[PDB]
Write a protein that binds this ligand. Sequence first.
Ligand code: A60
Lengths: 99, 99
Amino acid sequence: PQITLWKRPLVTIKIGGQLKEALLDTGADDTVLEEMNLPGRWKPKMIGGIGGFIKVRQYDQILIEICGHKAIGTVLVGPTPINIIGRNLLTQIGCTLNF
Amino acid sequence: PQITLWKRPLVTIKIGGQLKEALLDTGADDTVLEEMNLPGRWKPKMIGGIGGFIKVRQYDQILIEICGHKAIGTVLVGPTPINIIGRNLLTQIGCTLNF
Ligand SMILES: CCC(CC)CN(C[C@@H](O)[C@H](Cc1ccccc1)NC(=O)O[C@H]1CO[C@H]2OCC[C@H]21)S(=O)(=O)c1ccc(N)cc1
């Protein structure tokens, strides 16, 4: 689809068999989701945003469906202000900026 | 033009007679630029993201040229690690997300 930016580009995602709302964030290198239980192994990592660095749990090769488009990649889980879909997955669903 | 997301969507902008590189950020509600000495009045503001909040100065009706597309609106200025073009100006240049 073509999404305008007058409102936040929020979409429904499916991860770990659970539906969630997430923000399409072209300014994020990585995908960061709020606290949740994800199956499989994970390692602790650090990620930095506009206000500093937080601690997250890194999940690799996680299946995640974004607005009907499947992707398999890295998902970081931690105290982010909002679920964000970053470029590591936006590239997988073929997402581009156009003007 | 069309911009893929393999790398950060950095583009050249023109503000207050200065050329800078800035991130086209669909996750940012409002444009925030690295510290710079703009003239005119402003109102304090705090914006939040990963890591917490930073204090910024809100300037209104600031003219910015993004990839030759002229825009005018709110521009925040503060200790951001990177220049960020937010939705408040992305809409004005006709920018959409597509997949
Ligand atoms: C609340 C929704 C997001 C945070 C989740 C808002 N951010 C824009 C976001 O694109 C930010 C913009 C940003 C980019 C780079 C450095 C600081 C901020 N990128 C970001 O935090 O991504 C992190 C996760 O992937 C990594 O790659 C980038 C940093 C990591 S922000 O920087 O904090 C921001 C908040 C309010 C305004 N008006 C302008 C910008």
